[PDB]
Amino acid sequence: AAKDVKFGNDARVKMLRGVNVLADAVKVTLGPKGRNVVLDKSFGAPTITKDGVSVAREIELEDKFENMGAQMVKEVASKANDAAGDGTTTATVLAQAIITEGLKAVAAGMNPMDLKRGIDKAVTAAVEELKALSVPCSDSKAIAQVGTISANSDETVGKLIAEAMDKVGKEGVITVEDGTGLQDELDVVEGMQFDRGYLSPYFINKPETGAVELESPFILLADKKISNIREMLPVLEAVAKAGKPLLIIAEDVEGEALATLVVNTMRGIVKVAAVKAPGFGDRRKAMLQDIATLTGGTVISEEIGMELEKATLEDLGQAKRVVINKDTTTIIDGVGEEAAIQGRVAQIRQQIEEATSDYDREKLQERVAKLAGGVAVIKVGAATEVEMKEKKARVEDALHATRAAVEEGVVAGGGVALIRVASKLADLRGQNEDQNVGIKVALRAMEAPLRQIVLNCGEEPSVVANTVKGGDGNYGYNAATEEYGNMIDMGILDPTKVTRSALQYAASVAGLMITTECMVTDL
Amino acid sequence: AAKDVKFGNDARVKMLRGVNVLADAVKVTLGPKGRNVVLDKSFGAPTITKDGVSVAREIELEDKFENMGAQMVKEVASKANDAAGDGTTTATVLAQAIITEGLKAVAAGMNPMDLKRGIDKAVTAAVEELKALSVPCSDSKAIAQVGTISANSDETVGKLIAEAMDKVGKEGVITVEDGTGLQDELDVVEGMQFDRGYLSPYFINKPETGAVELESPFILLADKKISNIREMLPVLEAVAKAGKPLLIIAEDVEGEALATLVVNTMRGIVKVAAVKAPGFGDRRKAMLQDIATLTGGTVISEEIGMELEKATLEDLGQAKRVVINKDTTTIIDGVGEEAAIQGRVAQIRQQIEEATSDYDREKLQERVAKLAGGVAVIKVGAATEVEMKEKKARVEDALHATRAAVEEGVVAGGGVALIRVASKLADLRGQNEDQNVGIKVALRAMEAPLRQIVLNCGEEPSVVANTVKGGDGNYGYNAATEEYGNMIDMGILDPTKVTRSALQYAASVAGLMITTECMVTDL
Amino acid sequence: AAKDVKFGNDARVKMLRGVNVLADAVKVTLGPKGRNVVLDKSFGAPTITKDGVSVAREIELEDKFENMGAQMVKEVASKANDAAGDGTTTATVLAQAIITEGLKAVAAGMNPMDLKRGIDKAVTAAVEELKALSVPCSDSKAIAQVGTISANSDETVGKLIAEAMDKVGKEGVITVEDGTGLQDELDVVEGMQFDRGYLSPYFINKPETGAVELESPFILLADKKISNIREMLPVLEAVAKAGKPLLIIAEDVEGEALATLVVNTMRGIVKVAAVKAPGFGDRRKAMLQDIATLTGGTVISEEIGMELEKATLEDLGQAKRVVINKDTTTIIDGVGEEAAIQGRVAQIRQQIEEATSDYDREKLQERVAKLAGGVAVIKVGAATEVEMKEKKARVEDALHATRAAVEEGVVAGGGVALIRVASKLADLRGQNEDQNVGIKVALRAMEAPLRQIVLNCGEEPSVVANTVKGGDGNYGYNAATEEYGNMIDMGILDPTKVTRSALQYAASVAGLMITTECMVTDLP
Ligand SMILES: Nc1ncnc2c1ncn2[C@@H]1O[C@H](COP(=O)(O)OP(=O)(O)OP(=O)(O)O)[C@@H](O)[C@H]1O
Ligand SMILES: Nc1ncnc2c1ncn2[C@@H]1O[C@H](COP(=O)(O)OP(=O)(O)OP(=O)(O)O)[C@@H](O)[C@H]1O
Ligand SMILES: Nc1ncnc2c1ncn2[C@@H]1O[C@H](COP(=O)(O)OP(=O)(O)OP(=O)(O)O)[C@@H](O)[C@H]1O
Ligand SMILES: [K+]
Ligand SMILES: [K+]
Ligand SMILES: [K+]
Ligand SMILES: [Mg+2]
Ligand SMILES: [Mg+2]
Ligand SMILES: [Mg+2]
């Protein structure tokens, strides 16, 4: 259509106004004194959330240039959520600060590309300093504190994550689901976790989390791909009124041959799900047999010769609950037979003892680790559905932050890590003066998380930032208690992955955004 | 779409204005001197009701932020209705009071998260005090009093509930349905009650109660799930014009295929219903056989060898009336054969005797308990349909109240319980001053039910509140007579569950709502 | 006409919005790094100014309730201008801070009347602490520093005002007017220089200068107007016998008398020059008497009783030297008793004390400066008229501040005095908790000028305020150099009267505004 084309400072101030609207909506949520944002839903009741990426995703503006700025900055929060599941508000605050100071530098007349290069150099150096400053979670051993900080000073959630990880291992899968009582319940049940996703995005249910879930789903297993529709049409037709959603696990379902005609078939009564089988060959066949034994089902194979037309409901397996995500699909609880599960575990352990190859040994040890850990389920207790959603979001943030902490380490919370690495980069220089100004923009913007936390506390951000900068190491400011101290000792820990990801994504988007001279959008 | 984003006090006052509109509409109904609200209905005549959740559900506002506040507070009334089926108005009044005082505290500058934590701590302590204050409701007079109070001081409804529970047992099922006559009739007929719900929400009939009902539904029983459409197509085609809505009870029913093509089949002339069979295995087969004997039908099974096609209209059973709800499905009256039902009761009882296992004995005695109790049907007598709906609402409320009363006990009515619990929590303190202010907000809001009752009486809520606070124990104010006295002696009893639920849901939603700094909604 | 009525939080929010509009327009000028505000004028070019009172005067809002708030807070700047002539921006900033904190307190449910009482108590204690903290400003160096600070760090203005005050003295009068040149000029005239020229051009003794120069002349002071030579004829004959020149001050000399005086002027019998008396009714007689006292003469009037035919040489006044030009008359070293001059000056001082009008008081002080001391005129030099107006406003501010400094002393500038006073009042308490909160909001508002100055420099107000509070005595933050030091040593001095007046007026107005619960105004 006809285009509105804006240039220079007019385009940049419109972009900054949209950035500021999104970033203020997100930034009111930052920190332990951060407040909740109500997001209206046409679906049902409004969602009350402290989660910055949710707020950012809901933001969309009427002015088209402001809307472009808001969408571009919204990418920062969405990328932080996708990468680490936490620190999305910190990432948005960093992005807004970089954008504001970089646009001020552009107004001062510095070359925006050189400003972007300076920002990128400063952020690379800051990522290196964050890696150097990071204390591994094994040495610190403060998983409960990380979960508490991520769950907004909810010590119960932090202790729940700590118990779940001490029970199912630091790498075992943990799933957050809606409970039924007022209290949070930890349930270490038998389950399986594999890193695969759905073939099509049309299997997404009414919830907007992007992960499909099934109530007591059916289990169908196959290593050899089927040849015609009539061979599996009886299995789908059988599950037709079997109140257990047919979860098909095979190599790679063609959406045109299942999803299209099934969508023409059902209007949404039940969500037939198809997922990819990870691995290949004999490893995939062994995993399929293990999953069938877990769920009580059987695997169809050409060598065996047993056919889907001969398959019945009793032959196939089942799982109490299954959650399928693009990143990783988890089976929460499969009944099967406990004695059969234990016998299969013993057989796989004997296979480990018999095998001597490194690849076979490591894959079989991954198998036994998955079977031993099972699935930890955290039931979220809440009186109402809006409290349920808020608390579940906070528990998801705590789980993501604890996972990131065990993956990469911890640093001082409350923006102190960024303050410290900015102080160590005070001597960083670029190839020219505009690159040096970009470096200084990045270093000043690294203060923005702490200052926004202090503003949300209603305290004086400049005074607290000065006091923290005058300190050293993990010295910082406890916003929950409004006093200074060693942040590690007070338990205010941030995952190094979360801080690094927030800084990197905010830097990339904001550095690109400060280089924009022209904006083209619909009238 | 483009979003209207409001912050701070503007967002909070819009939210409070919407809360106030919904809460005033609901609160005019509170107490004995509460008045009726007319809810316009597009389908037909307006409904006149004194129920609070109905009014709250109908409230929806033009201003989008006020609408956000109204929907969030409406969740309180809907949650209370779902939990105890009574106390929705009290819950709304509590939620509005907490919201108002918490927003005043936020304007005073207290940290809203700490206010929410104080409210939650006060409400937890208040739930403990409600359990301590509760007195077991184990008398027929007490049950009658609870029903009378819950039926807007209708002693006839209270006595009807008391007689129904003294006849079918304090746990036997009781169903409220319209009566042709102008008088309320108690009918203790044989019936079956099982805790299961419909597979799909597409079986909901015209009435908005969320429970489907069938006129003389046909009964079909199965423990083995079907494989193809053609096995049951003669049964569906038969009942098609047999004259009885086909109620299908099977192991694990599903509508994936059934619901879509059946909806494509009928346009709504008659309602085909499918429900899950509770339990599993031999227990489910025994229950299915019992239901088939009750309704005169037979249970198709692979072991039996019978098939749906083989079954004729005479072979299959029927029920005078069936009401299916998500929580619990009841068969009001399954004719069958009285001699058959008797003989089956004697057989099952002998099975209980013969049996020695604790699980077997318990389930067996539960079976005979259901058979003996049957269903107590209360026919609501009204001259007109609007009076029918109003009186049926009040009878439903009385039934839910009496149920909760026998389950969890009774406390002083007229908001006296909350007053007493607030007086006992006067010494409760939090971790900081904002938490203490939140505790005080909760304690002050616990007075709101009594004050609103007094306002509906047209009396002075402050004077009555102070007079009740000056007293102790079950001392309160009889609003029906405008005189003070012992609430228990005067018969003004509230179910402890109802009071606790109202308080908990109001607290959860209102504590979340007072923490909101930003609101995002469509323009 | 029909009225719009608003109550409680809504009315207070609209009032605060209007106050904030006015204060945001004004506070951008506070401090050395403060900027200029352009005020559109329906007539002439727009005015560029760095004065809070002008910006505040121009502010008027469309929203009626916001306009109410703006007008009320505009009273602060107007009153500060009226009393001290400086500090109007500091006063508007203080009023905005008090209003903001007090409205916050009202939103917390505290009684606004008690908040106002606490604010009043804190401000009274603050005025006492300012008086205690003030130091005299009598040296010319401190006066120059005060003028420089009040002129937006224009050392030339401060030094010029210091020189003017040193010349004219304590009783001297200094006025600021436009100058033709690009440079500021100081013109000081001593003794009597009343603005009346020769009644006849031919009286000019010195043609190359176009002025009459009389050496040791007699002075004739007649309160009446004359047109005939008969009545002064004995006086003229006596003067001619004496041989010294004569100067006539009278309501008017014209016709035959003037012509005869001129003819005798050329003929040389008597060196005579006649000029009009100064001023108008009720004042002209006072001027004549002042001149008689200076020159040791007597005024010839019909009210007093004496006639001019009976006037003698002893009746005539005496002066050392006289200069008549077309525009003004100058008398040098009038031969009159000193004690009489001091007595007449004391009577005029008593009239000043009795006077209740600005015009009357300035005219009486001008008369005093004519009798004793001197009168100075500062011609402001600027390249254009907009620059002329801006510089004239700054010079008038500097002059007002220097007069205030001489009257009541100086305190540390840069909002440091208010910071120290608020620190000294931390223990002050009221009758109840609401009064205590009012005291606290007044004390916190006392930090507003320093914070706004720092904000106008682009720095962090909170950090600088904390650093200044951590200091003691006159330690402060020089905004011009962005450095810390002794405000007195770096020459950042604020008149005690200016600071006290700003605090007092802002407190009174703001305290009344926070007490508002309803607003009544015309509908839109
Ligand atoms: N008590 C505390 N004192 C100081 N800083 C704290 C405290 N608790 C948490 N923080 C800091 O607050 C930040 C986390 O704030 P918040 O959880 O609101 O946002 P986020 O994690 O960046 O994003 P989001 O939760 O929206 O994904 C971290 O920098 C953390 O170290
Ligand atoms: N005669 C009475 N005197 C005093 N209080 C009474 C009397 N009758 C009932 N109440 C009180 O009135 C309250 C019940 O009010 P009401 O039945 O109007 O609404 P509700 O139970 O809160 O909600 P709903 O809309 O679900 O019916 C209880 O607290 C009960 O104790
Ligand atoms: N170099 C400086 N460093 C610090 N403070 C300074 C400096 N120069 C001036 N100030 C302070 O600026 C304040 C007044 O400056 P300004 O002329 O902007 O406002 P004002 O006198 O309050 O207003 P107005 O001239 O409109 O009546 C005083 O407190 C003075 O001490
Ligand atoms: K957040
Ligand atoms: K009611
Ligand atoms: K100024
Ligand atoms: Mg977080
Ligand atoms: Mg009720
Ligand atoms: Mg000034």
mmCIF file of N, CA, C and O in Angstrom, chain C residues 364-416:
data_model
loop_
_atom_site.group_PDB
_atom_site.id
_atom_site.type_symbol
_atom_site.label_atom_id
_atom_site.label_comp_id
_atom_site.label_asym_id
_atom_site.label_seq_id
_atom_site.Cartn_x
_atom_site.Cartn_y
_atom_site.Cartn_z
ATOM 1 N N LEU C 364 10.876 59.806 47.583
ATOM 2 C CA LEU C 364 11.492 60.330 48.800
ATOM 3 C C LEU C 364 12.955 59.913 48.917
ATOM 4 O O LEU C 364 13.804 60.716 49.323
ATOM 5 N N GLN C 365 13.269 58.659 48.587
ATOM 6 C CA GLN C 365 14.665 58.234 48.604
ATOM 7 C C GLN C 365 15.488 58.971 47.553
ATOM 8 O O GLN C 365 16.664 59.274 47.790
ATOM 9 N N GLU C 366 14.891 59.280 46.400
ATOM 10 C CA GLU C 366 15.571 60.104 45.407
ATOM 11 C C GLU C 366 15.846 61.501 45.950
ATOM 12 O O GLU C 366 16.921 62.064 45.720
ATOM 13 N N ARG C 367 14.878 62.079 46.662
ATOM 14 C CA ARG C 367 15.096 63.374 47.302
ATOM 15 C C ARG C 367 16.239 63.302 48.309
ATOM 16 O O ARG C 367 17.070 64.217 48.388
ATOM 17 N N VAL C 368 16.286 62.226 49.095
ATOM 18 C CA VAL C 368 17.367 62.053 50.064
ATOM 19 C C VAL C 368 18.707 61.999 49.343
ATOM 20 O O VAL C 368 19.678 62.651 49.744
ATOM 21 N N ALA C 369 18.773 61.219 48.261
ATOM 22 C CA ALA C 369 20.001 61.115 47.481
ATOM 23 C C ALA C 369 20.379 62.448 46.848
ATOM 24 O O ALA C 369 21.561 62.706 46.597
ATOM 25 N N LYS C 370 19.390 63.287 46.545
ATOM 26 C CA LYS C 370 19.688 64.631 46.065
ATOM 27 C C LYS C 370 20.307 65.484 47.168
ATOM 28 O O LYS C 370 21.292 66.194 46.931
ATOM 29 N N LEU C 371 19.744 65.431 48.377
ATOM 30 C CA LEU C 371 20.280 66.221 49.484
ATOM 31 C C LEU C 371 21.674 65.751 49.891
ATOM 32 O O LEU C 371 22.653 66.498 49.779
ATOM 33 N N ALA C 372 21.781 64.517 50.367
ATOM 34 C CA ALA C 372 23.050 63.888 50.695
ATOM 35 C C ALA C 372 23.260 62.697 49.775
ATOM 36 O O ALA C 372 22.346 62.269 49.075
ATOM 37 N N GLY C 373 24.481 62.160 49.781
ATOM 38 C CA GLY C 373 24.838 61.040 48.915
ATOM 39 C C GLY C 373 24.717 61.437 47.447
ATOM 40 O O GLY C 373 24.822 62.622 47.118
ATOM 41 N N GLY C 374 24.501 60.471 46.554
ATOM 42 C CA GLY C 374 24.412 60.784 45.135
ATOM 43 C C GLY C 374 23.428 59.850 44.438
ATOM 44 O O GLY C 374 22.815 58.967 45.053
ATOM 45 N N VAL C 375 23.281 60.062 43.130
ATOM 46 C CA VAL C 375 22.385 59.277 42.292
ATOM 47 C C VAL C 375 23.192 58.701 41.136
ATOM 48 O O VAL C 375 23.954 59.422 40.483
ATOM 49 N N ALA C 376 23.003 57.413 40.870
ATOM 50 C CA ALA C 376 23.710 56.706 39.816
ATOM 51 C C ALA C 376 22.707 56.123 38.835
ATOM 52 O O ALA C 376 21.633 55.652 39.225
ATOM 53 N N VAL C 377 23.070 56.164 37.560
ATOM 54 C CA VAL C 377 22.282 55.597 36.480
ATOM 55 C C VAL C 377 23.193 54.634 35.731
ATOM 56 O O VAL C 377 24.299 55.008 35.317
ATOM 57 N N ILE C 378 22.749 53.392 35.594
ATOM 58 C CA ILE C 378 23.481 52.356 34.881
ATOM 59 C C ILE C 378 22.837 52.161 33.517
ATOM 60 O O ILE C 378 21.710 51.662 33.416
ATOM 61 N N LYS C 379 23.541 52.568 32.464
ATOM 62 C CA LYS C 379 23.074 52.380 31.095
ATOM 63 C C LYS C 379 23.541 51.009 30.633
ATOM 64 O O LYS C 379 24.743 50.766 30.487
ATOM 65 N N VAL C 380 22.588 50.116 30.415
ATOM 66 C CA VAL C 380 22.895 48.750 30.015
ATOM 67 C C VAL C 380 23.253 48.755 28.537
ATOM 68 O O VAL C 380 22.514 49.300 27.711
ATOM 69 N N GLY C 381 24.402 48.175 28.201
ATOM 70 C CA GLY C 381 24.859 48.131 26.827
ATOM 71 C C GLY C 381 24.569 46.782 26.199
ATOM 72 O O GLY C 381 24.943 45.737 26.736
ATOM 73 N N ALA C 382 23.889 46.823 25.056
ATOM 74 C CA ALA C 382 23.542 45.624 24.312
ATOM 75 C C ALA C 382 23.467 45.966 22.834
ATOM 76 O O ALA C 382 23.199 47.111 22.462
ATOM 77 N N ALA C 383 23.707 44.961 21.995
ATOM 78 C CA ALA C 383 23.690 45.183 20.555
ATOM 79 C C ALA C 383 22.275 45.293 20.005
ATOM 80 O O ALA C 383 22.051 46.017 19.031
ATOM 81 N N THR C 384 21.315 44.595 20.604
ATOM 82 C CA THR C 384 19.940 44.590 20.130
ATOM 83 C C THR C 384 18.988 44.817 21.296
ATOM 84 O O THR C 384 19.380 44.805 22.465
ATOM 85 N N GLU C 385 17.714 45.026 20.957
ATOM 86 C CA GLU C 385 16.716 45.338 21.972
ATOM 87 C C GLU C 385 16.351 44.113 22.800
ATOM 88 O O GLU C 385 16.064 44.241 23.993
ATOM 89 N N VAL C 386 16.343 42.927 22.192
ATOM 90 C CA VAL C 386 16.083 41.713 22.956
ATOM 91 C C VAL C 386 17.211 41.464 23.954
ATOM 92 O O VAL C 386 16.967 41.148 25.129
ATOM 93 N N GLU C 387 18.459 41.621 23.509
ATOM 94 C CA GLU C 387 19.588 41.540 24.423
ATOM 95 C C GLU C 387 19.512 42.639 25.469
ATOM 96 O O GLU C 387 19.865 42.424 26.632
ATOM 97 N N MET C 388 19.054 43.827 25.070
ATOM 98 C CA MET C 388 18.897 44.917 26.023
ATOM 99 C C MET C 388 17.922 44.547 27.128
ATOM 100 O O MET C 388 18.203 44.763 28.309
ATOM 101 N N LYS C 389 16.770 43.977 26.767
ATOM 102 C CA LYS C 389 15.795 43.594 27.782
ATOM 103 C C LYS C 389 16.334 42.498 28.690
ATOM 104 O O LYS C 389 16.183 42.571 29.916
ATOM 105 N N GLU C 390 16.968 41.475 28.112
ATOM 106 C CA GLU C 390 17.496 40.388 28.935
ATOM 107 C C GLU C 390 18.559 40.900 29.905
ATOM 108 O O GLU C 390 18.526 40.600 31.109
ATOM 109 N N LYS C 391 19.501 41.700 29.400
ATOM 110 C CA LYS C 391 20.571 42.213 30.243
ATOM 111 C C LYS C 391 20.039 43.196 31.276
ATOM 112 O O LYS C 391 20.538 43.240 32.402
ATOM 113 N N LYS C 392 19.034 43.997 30.916
ATOM 114 C CA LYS C 392 18.437 44.907 31.884
ATOM 115 C C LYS C 392 17.757 44.143 33.003
ATOM 116 O O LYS C 392 17.844 44.533 34.170
ATOM 117 N N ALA C 393 17.055 43.059 32.667
ATOM 118 C CA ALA C 393 16.451 42.236 33.706
ATOM 119 C C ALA C 393 17.514 41.660 34.629
ATOM 120 O O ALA C 393 17.360 41.676 35.855
ATOM 121 N N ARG C 394 18.618 41.173 34.057
ATOM 122 C CA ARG C 394 19.688 40.621 34.885
ATOM 123 C C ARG C 394 20.326 41.692 35.771
ATOM 124 O O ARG C 394 20.639 41.437 36.939
ATOM 125 N N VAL C 395 20.516 42.899 35.236
ATOM 126 C CA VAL C 395 21.125 43.978 36.011
ATOM 127 C C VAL C 395 20.186 44.440 37.119
ATOM 128 O O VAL C 395 20.624 44.755 38.229
ATOM 129 N N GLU C 396 18.882 44.503 36.834
ATOM 130 C CA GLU C 396 17.913 44.839 37.873
ATOM 131 C C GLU C 396 17.899 43.778 38.964
ATOM 132 O O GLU C 396 17.793 44.101 40.154
ATOM 133 N N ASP C 397 18.016 42.503 38.579
ATOM 134 C CA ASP C 397 18.108 41.442 39.576
ATOM 135 C C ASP C 397 19.338 41.644 40.443
ATOM 136 O O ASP C 397 19.276 41.512 41.669
ATOM 137 N N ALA C 398 20.480 41.909 39.809
ATOM 138 C CA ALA C 398 21.718 42.112 40.552
ATOM 139 C C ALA C 398 21.602 43.287 41.515
ATOM 140 O O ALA C 398 22.060 43.207 42.658
ATOM 141 N N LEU C 399 21.002 44.391 41.066
ATOM 142 C CA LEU C 399 20.829 45.557 41.929
ATOM 143 C C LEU C 399 19.927 45.246 43.116
ATOM 144 O O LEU C 399 20.236 45.615 44.259
ATOM 145 N N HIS C 400 18.806 44.565 42.867
ATOM 146 C CA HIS C 400 17.912 44.191 43.957
ATOM 147 C C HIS C 400 18.608 43.263 44.941
ATOM 148 O O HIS C 400 18.470 43.416 46.160
ATOM 149 N N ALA C 401 19.366 42.292 44.427
ATOM 150 C CA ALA C 401 20.076 41.357 45.289
ATOM 151 C C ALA C 401 21.140 42.061 46.118
ATOM 152 O O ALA C 401 21.334 41.736 47.289
ATOM 153 N N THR C 402 21.856 43.014 45.522
ATOM 154 C CA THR C 402 22.870 43.743 46.276
ATOM 155 C C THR C 402 22.236 44.588 47.371
ATOM 156 O O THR C 402 22.759 44.655 48.491
ATOM 157 N N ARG C 403 21.113 45.244 47.071
ATOM 158 C CA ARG C 403 20.418 45.994 48.113
ATOM 159 C C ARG C 403 19.943 45.073 49.231
ATOM 160 O O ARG C 403 20.084 45.399 50.416
ATOM 161 N N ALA C 404 19.399 43.906 48.875
ATOM 162 C CA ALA C 404 18.979 42.937 49.883
ATOM 163 C C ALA C 404 20.160 42.454 50.716
ATOM 164 O O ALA C 404 20.032 42.250 51.929
ATOM 165 N N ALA C 405 21.309 42.240 50.076
ATOM 166 C CA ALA C 405 22.498 41.786 50.785
ATOM 167 C C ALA C 405 22.968 42.833 51.781
ATOM 168 O O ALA C 405 23.344 42.505 52.910
ATOM 169 N N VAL C 406 22.979 44.101 51.369
ATOM 170 C CA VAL C 406 23.382 45.157 52.290
ATOM 171 C C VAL C 406 22.375 45.279 53.426
ATOM 172 O O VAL C 406 22.750 45.568 54.570
ATOM 173 N N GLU C 407 21.091 45.050 53.144
ATOM 174 C CA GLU C 407 20.070 45.214 54.174
ATOM 175 C C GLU C 407 20.124 44.094 55.209
ATOM 176 O O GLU C 407 20.053 44.350 56.416
ATOM 177 N N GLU C 408 20.251 42.842 54.760
ATOM 178 C CA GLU C 408 20.108 41.699 55.654
ATOM 179 C C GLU C 408 21.275 40.722 55.651
ATOM 180 O O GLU C 408 21.241 39.754 56.417
ATOM 181 N N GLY C 409 22.285 40.923 54.821
ATOM 182 C CA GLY C 409 23.431 40.038 54.810
ATOM 183 C C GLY C 409 23.344 38.979 53.731
ATOM 184 O O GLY C 409 22.459 38.977 52.872
ATOM 185 N N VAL C 410 24.300 38.051 53.789
ATOM 186 C CA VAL C 410 24.434 37.010 52.782
ATOM 187 C C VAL C 410 24.526 35.645 53.448
ATOM 188 O O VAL C 410 24.885 35.512 54.618
ATOM 189 N N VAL C 411 24.189 34.623 52.665
ATOM 190 C CA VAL C 411 24.330 33.225 53.040
ATOM 191 C C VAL C 411 24.919 32.499 51.840
ATOM 192 O O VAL C 411 25.041 33.056 50.747
ATOM 193 N N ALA C 412 25.304 31.244 52.055
ATOM 194 C CA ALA C 412 25.852 30.456 50.962
ATOM 195 C C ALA C 412 24.805 30.278 49.871
ATOM 196 O O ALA C 412 23.639 29.986 50.147
ATOM 197 N N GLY C 413 25.227 30.444 48.624
ATOM 198 C CA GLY C 413 24.339 30.294 47.495
ATOM 199 C C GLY C 413 24.237 28.854 47.055
ATOM 200 O O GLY C 413 24.652 27.931 47.759
ATOM 201 N N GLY C 414 23.693 28.658 45.858
ATOM 202 C CA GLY C 414 23.578 27.310 45.340
ATOM 203 C C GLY C 414 22.616 26.461 46.133
ATOM 204 O O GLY C 414 22.747 25.235 46.145
ATOM 205 N N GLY C 415 21.639 27.085 46.786
ATOM 206 C CA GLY C 415 20.696 26.363 47.614
ATOM 207 C C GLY C 415 21.326 25.707 48.819
ATOM 208 O O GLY C 415 20.707 24.844 49.442
ATOM 209 N N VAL C 416 22.551 26.102 49.168
ATOM 210 C CA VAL C 416 23.258 25.500 50.293
ATOM 211 C C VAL C 416 22.691 25.992 51.619
ATOM 212 O O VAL C 416 22.600 25.231 52.588
#
